[model samples]
Target chain A: QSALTQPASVSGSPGQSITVSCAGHTSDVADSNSISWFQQHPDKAPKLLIYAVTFRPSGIPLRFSGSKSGNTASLTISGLLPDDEADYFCMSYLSDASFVFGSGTKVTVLRQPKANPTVTLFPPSSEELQANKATLVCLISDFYPGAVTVAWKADGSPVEAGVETTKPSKQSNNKYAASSYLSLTPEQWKSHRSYSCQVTHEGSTVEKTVAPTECS
Target chain B: QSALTQPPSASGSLGQSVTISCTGTSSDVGGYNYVSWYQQHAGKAPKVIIYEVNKRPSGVPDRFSGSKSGNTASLTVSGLQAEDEADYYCSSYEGSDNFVFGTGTKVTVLGQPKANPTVTLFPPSSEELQANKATLVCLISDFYPGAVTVAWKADGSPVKAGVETTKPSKQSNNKYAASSYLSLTPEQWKSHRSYSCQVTHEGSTVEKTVAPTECS
Candidate 1:
């Protein structure tokens, strides 16, 4: 068996409880309960949920708890919401002082129909332009489901290089939002007449365009 | 965000070659090009073998190589050694100042004789006791080459809970050692009367038992 084992997926409805298990070697998990759990969305960094078996870091919801029995560790989430649909991973600290992460488990929270995300583009400020730096941000917000794609363009041409896009993240109101960033030299930003940020979902696309304008 | 994806295990004999793969999405590995690999022995901190896709840090062997293809990154060990038997993990930098690690892979060096570890069951201690609580430690020492299984028992009955075991760790002498701990209530400690530590290696087992009175 692998050092640690976890299931591939778990599902629940909103307000329900779901538990994910991680089975490890007796030697790895038996030492002081150094097991941890993480929550991950599609393109985001994994968030530490429970560390050292049962301790939650500040700001984590109290509804998430961790426990261990024998060599198996578990993360239980109570009062789940549609926003809870993501991935879960378990980790264990070994005697070798290395941490082993479990194969990710997808948590599907069944819910109602979704809404399309709205898109907006923000151009670099004049002060930033003067410093020869240009940064463009594409904001996607208020989507019911947390899956969306972002595409960028500069001067009517597709831009693939040096673009950073965030994973769709859950908002407090049960909606989702994401951002994409494009950076350029000040010369390029001032010379470019048009830039576009496109958000695509379920065969539909919303795009925002920005045109260069000199400060008065 | 989802963790990077990796295989469960990889294996090669002495002097052979092996490669482990880590898969991520365009938003992480493909977009940022920030991928790293680690080598870990049991009970040890993982050492970064490759960083930034293909860059090997100073002191890392040239035999270990890294490369990326689209959304997948790979670590190739050109000449595997017996000492290379351990676990490997991958990490990627996603946007939003977040990082994700892959499910680990256990690398086995086949056709080798497993080292047999020696077991010493240390009596429960009073020096660190608090109220009616105490901890029993099983110190396993002096194993050659690596990897052993450990378990605990109370009065010849298998211990089903409240036991912690460390990964088999390499010692300064080039041997291996691991520690297993058992927590006890004063009542349970005195009533159980006897406890044992067991180590299993290559089809043979060693058991060391101690009585409650033997503890100071």
Candidate 2:
């Protein structure tokens, strides 16, 4: 039918355990073992935690597990850490040979202390613009929690057509950094002076907007 | 160690078709038949359009198809419509219960920009709060391409717990509407003076705030 259903949020304390559930049709959840689970923090692409019901990918912690019974599949995290706070989603193969994802579930680690990330936006270089290309980069760093998302826009329009984003990966200092690139032709890049890079983490959105002084 | 890789963009004209490719390794895409594809517009959770390599979910147009060869998978949208322009992602099952998502690909239909959505936040009724609990609803409608994101804030801080959100579903008039609900106890509801629901779409962010006095 449609995507499976998941709770909007779940919570636990550090060292505690929590279970996130996904609801689906009997034929989908019980008829097959194709269910999988994902963990996503704000501003980052989702990471698969469990798949095929109870299997863990290489290098994933053993504390994460999955189980399916009847119309529900559940992902259980034992010994939850601060880094475990994120959005969780479940996916399943339908009897129709298609697939669907549960509405995401936000996992909050209560009373956890974290640092806010510093984000800087860099405009395209003049030399690149003169060559008929524009590349803007959003560099995020110093965040305690390792997951964040970076979004781009050009001249008040969603710059979806040519946006490239990276995962919020670990930095050398145990902080985090990620980047997004927006590439456009010099003509269109000069058509507007406004470009923005928005970084989202937890519940806050920080954005930086810059105009091209060199091109205009 | 990470997800699959996808191009930053693809495009086609009306009546023409385009394909988006996702590349992985033998440990994932090349080893399993559990690949899936999702379509997302700005500010919304992704919706799965293809799964198990080449199967379209029911009700999805035949023009949207999927395929796989060795270590790579592809989603082809034929006779591309303006509505087909959005971000697309691919997911594959890595062995041992792990999964990975490809970097996103934004598809552009030759010439079409979507209209913004409208959002309304309903105040939590005092009487309902007095019953020891209440639910505040964020109603978003009139959105094109069936994609948008909803967030809740209480007194400027994001509320990540007890929030339930729905995926963008098709409407009778071909537009889209999605709702999100925030559950609160009477004490918590009365303690907050400002409640806000923010909706983000491709080109706009619309927020509505309600205070207790507004409902009283």
Candidate 3:
């Protein structure tokens, strides 16, 4: 319920144009009044973009704009320049310490349009991704330090313990990278069942629903 | 920097489906996909139920999972069971130092569910001496959900509601936000008295106070 639906990756070129949109259910967006945007470079913390939805922060580029209609939020990068080729995220508040994220979008300003890469959710599963055998996999693409928990929920119910991952690939900036993982079972993936993944770090917690992507 | 702690709450009847989301920004989730979610009962430490993005630790049910996109992340559970009702929170890193939290969305398994519950942010507060005709602007999170009311506080006492605060606009992400302005001469701005901007929403309150920063 706290997930933001977004494109896997977005790309443009120097002096080109591009835009990324974030979609959420009615509860998190359509009727909600506040939305904020953030931008992150290869190894830097995310900087504030449009806050409260449309107001640009001081000293931000004029090319960037934020706006919302109903449950949908859009970030427009007009005159898309070289510096704008970064990962952008849109966020809003959820009730009671719950927040959602759109599926990550990777925006590339390729010298040539054909050089864009596809985004993948790593580690394919083999066993029938049943309702019982589920696991956690924290995917922090360009960064790492993997230090969060991954747990499971049984149809809105609670499961048990889980595990965090060792560091993943490291960045040139000297930062460690990694992802977290939790394992589930067959019956857990029963049809019409619900599953959730969660992370807790830096005084915040977040999660996602785990419905078998396909017959894994 | 550190991990955030949250309470989990959810409620639903048999055959109903429900979802929970954790929220945090790059400061936390960015550095590490360790982002996770937890479920808590009355006065109990939350247990790891979902980890990484979509893994549900061993022995856990498939009804729980995780997912993320940019600075926002989420978790969902379906087929709401009777005992699925409890408090839930989403968390992640804000980078290495600070932490963040979503307003915490509550999932109720009552006969019918409302779209969303509301949450609010705290206003700005400053401490300095006061002078005649001194005005202070409320430093608020443009990302907050509701319109704010700014007031002047001298030594923890109410001065008066100065100018009406600005009603913030929305961003492409759809969050409401803006900063309030305050006017005061060096004397007023330098006073050692305490000033604050407070906001009340959903029967909750938060306040932030700022002492005059050394003038450049």
Candidate 4:
């Protein structure tokens, strides 16, 4: 048996209610007690929120509810809190040694007055060059709502390989910061001139460009 | 809509091809450019191998391919390598900002014999104790076939509660490893004489024991 279907994302504002739906075949959707819902926060494993479609686990808040009908099931989260902005997954039990989970949906709280991130491109480090490799850093800070897209370009042309980005981490001041790294062999680092980063947040784009000579 | 459905397991011999299917409703699988697949190896986070129904990631080996027709998306692992033995998870973006993942399948490369795991019991470190946290950890490493059982004991009596174990995660060296945790309040551990962790892999069971620092 395969997994149940789920929306990739669902959003609502504070005090607003939103529902996530899960669809499956009749073979898996016949029983109400077969479905379960889970909530997951970043860097943490999922926690059971509802079981048997409608029963809440020990301490799951009342704002969360579930229902099942005819080859489909749903989870409703009301009164969206900031912490409620996490991923939710639906699972169905078929039999022993067989179970399926929905593709999961990211639940966004959608706060007002979103703050865009500040982007800065830093040249490769001497520390890395000594090891025969160089890594460029694109620093992102002061973002709210925690969603952004990052891309890299070489001499103004978009490139894809050797890039890594960390998940946004909350700062002490309540804003978020992240790091995107671009790695290159020392030879490639010296051959290329002008590497840049483009960060898009809340419909605005921030570009930071740097060249090898900048490190000197 | 709900999440797509996927098989729980798919297998093939080395260098052979195996295809995993994800079926969904017209709302999701009806030619939307949102289908994606991820690969999760042992001990590491999941990585996007395919996205947008047919696009493969840059670093992903060409042996992995993706496509779609009607209400189904498919991932074909061609010329299977030992490295291709991992968990495959599929997801679909069901229009309207909603997305769902196929429950996921454990993709296997057949014909490898079984090897028992090396079990190690790690007691709470001094820093962990200083931080007022005490969790006895049992590490199961170097296993094959990816099936094992674990148990816990306090003063020779089985301890059922406060026990947790993780699924087998593959190691960089091609061996598999897993871990179990037994959490304890300071009072509970201090009152107990000693504890043992039992790991059963293949036909042999390995046991290791540890005592509190004061008792030691």
Candidate 5:
């Protein structure tokens, strides 16, 4: 994944607002423009804030928004809550079929500054099934850097086995990121497909769901 | 892709190999393939190691490994000693055009654990030539499994360009933190300039970098 530019830091007062910008080239963000936003905190995993530009995944607050115009994209956290003080990241699908990400935005919780959080999603999005048992991934961004555990939950119940989690890589920015993957039967994905990426960071719980979507 | 931080060099014994790990926050590696490792030989560009964390980058050696512990993603270099004397790094998709790197880590050969290893660098707020005076650090709490590397760079050039390295101590979990010192001139650190802290583990490389002032 390649891009042209990243942000240094973006901040706002609680109850106020803030937006992070991810600027890139035609191939990375501008061309394909499948942008997603992630929220992170120190020592915690990342949370999926927005995806495909304006669409927020299940469970995300409406206060967060994503939009793109021309070659630039933006993520706006409205009615900024004190808990919003975490890192934020933007990602886009590349023309080469691979996806790219933007430098994350650190959401400083001016009111309740707790340990940072990480991002998580048990299953990944491939839109294509490579095998009878498709693998889904969970990702968390902008958490405090540390080792983490990730598990899959089906319909709010923890999945039994067949799950693998890993620590995130530290980027040039001080923020940390991590990921986890789950393998499931195609039957499961075909049915009421719902998998959540649950994470245990310094001991906090953060999770996101991978809902069934039409394979684009 | 998210840029990572890693030491420039590392080493181990012929019979017993060492493992070096790269750590990142959840915002970068957690649940994302955007994270990958790389290897470099002296003056050449870095090669892909574990792409998307656990998956080996195309054509990479198998001995290297990529794993995650929550938000802390790692690259492990298996086997050890003399021959594996090149620069290593870890890269990830941050979002849009932004990418980052770690202060490079350096490895050295040693029969016994070294008592102390020091890393110093200009501060993140440091400006240019004055910016070169900035100092940074990498910290890890566990060790005993193997050693890691760290190095510094200024304006895209290796600060300790021609220096050799030594191996670190073995820890129970093979955990450790590292840092490097980079002092650059203002012109060297203006908008668009890059600096990093990197490390190599197993065959994959991990790294992190800082954003340009203008972007900040």
Candidate 6:
């Protein structure tokens, strides 16, 4: 059986309404009333919203409703709330009791777009210095979409040696986090060289230098 | 209608002998007896040494001789000396008197130990990285005798498409320099295959490989 298809993303503002659609052929949505809807917020487990095409589950809000047309099933959210921003999926039971799911949809609650990340840099510890290696780390947090370009520099020159950066990881607050590292030898660290981590995101640039607190 | 073919290089020690071969089709070397061979020192015009496939010029020494077998003609140097170190080219009369030259060969007479090239293989540059095609470069420099074989491997298997190698040329330091290129699509490069360049110089084999970590 083929999987149901859904639009990649849907969007609405608070107090407004939006509908996400899942399309399938005869054996799925059109000829079956055993369809279900699920809502999943970022970094959280999914919760059942609608079951049996139109029945709301126990704790699901009354604003969340489901319906089926000729070949499509729809999830309609009325009076959308800020917490409603999440990924949504719809599933259906086949004639033989097998179930198929719709590809997930990303529902974006269009609020203020101040999703720029905050960057902080830290220097190596004494253990790193004693081991003949120094590691500097840059932590980035609170970004959306999680697409960023990262670069490292030593004494104003772009560096190529021992640089490691990570893909963005989603946080519990629905934001993204990423970290970058610069590794150098202990002999070079004592030379008073300056190293920086530069991140470019959403057409803007931000940077930080590795000057940590002196408590250590 | 194509040019004659010759080896990239020939080498010998003082008082040693070596033979260089030139190959052609029936329309050239096998059609008539007009094949000739020439010797050229650096920064000078080539001087004819063997003409008519077996005859020497007026001032040419008796150490050089020539012969023909089937579609191939050969030049042999017996009891080589210091001044015999030069580049060699073979030519054949086509149609009436129009002559075509063979790819030249560098003849080296080693009085001391031979030198090996410093080989380095580079990944695709930014310009190539941004396009559908990625071009890799292999640089060979500072070698003696100016003769080497270059090969390309993708995932440890031999690859022949889009491979081009330059003939070795004498550099300012009296050594030789050469370069090779391997062209591939961005999809092929992004597949994280291990690409290598293998160079064979005078019985010594030098190899370098580039590992692509993108899209792995």
- Candidate 6 TM-score to native: 0.30
> What are the lDDT scores of the predictions, listed in order?
0.65, 0.66, 0.47, 0.65, 0.50, 0.64
Per-residue lDDT of model 4, residues A1-216, tens digit only: 555766644654677877877878777775445667777655333556786666676556887888777678788888876887666767675444245667666555654545777665555445446567665656566576555557889887887676655445555456666556566858767788777888866446778766675233
Please give, for residues A1-216, the per-residue lDDT of candidate 2 as tens digits. 555766545555667777767877767776767667777666356776885666676677888888766668777888867787667877785657456677676664655446677555556545456656665556555566634666777688766676655334454455555555456767767788688888766445588776666533
Write down the DockQ of candidate 1: 0.01
Candidates in order, interface RMSD in Å: 26.1, 17.5, 25.4, 17.1, 22.2, 32.1
For model 5, the interface Cα RMSD in angstroms equals 22.2
**Model 6 regions lying over 4 Å from their true place:** A95-97, A114-216, B1-216
Candidate 3 lDDT, B78-194, residue by residue in tens: 766434554465656343332344323334555432121121111121222321333343333324344445445555776643323344432222234333333345465466546
Q: Rank the candidates by lDDT, best first.
A: 2, 4, 1, 6, 5, 3
Ranking by TM-score: 2, 4, 1, 5, 3, 6
Off by over 4 Å in 2: A25-34, A43-45, A68-71, A96-100, A110-216, B11-16, B26-35, B40-47, B67-73, B91-99, B107-110, B113-216
TM-score of each: 0.37, 0.49, 0.32, 0.41, 0.35, 0.30
Q: Give one digit per residue, the lDDT tens place, for model 5 in B1-216.
A: 334445544566643454555566555654345776544332222334456556754345577677777556666666654334445566555544333445343244344343332221222331222325322322221232345666555556676532222223222212333323342334444543566665554454456555453211
Give the runs in model 4 whose Cα sits over 4 Å from its true position. A1-216, B1-9, B22-48, B51-54, B66-75, B82-106, B127-135, B145-147, B152-177, B180-195, B210-216
What range of 10 consecutive residues in model 6 chain A has the weakest lDDT sum?
A207-216
- TM-score of candidate 2 chain A against the true chain A: 0.58
Comparison by TM-score, 2 against 6, better one? 2
lDDT score for candidate 1 against the true structure: 0.65
- Ten consecutive residues with minimal summed lDDT in candidate 5 chain A? A120-129
Give one digit per residue, the lDDT tens place, for model 5 in A24-83: 777656656666766646523244677566667666678788767858877677786667
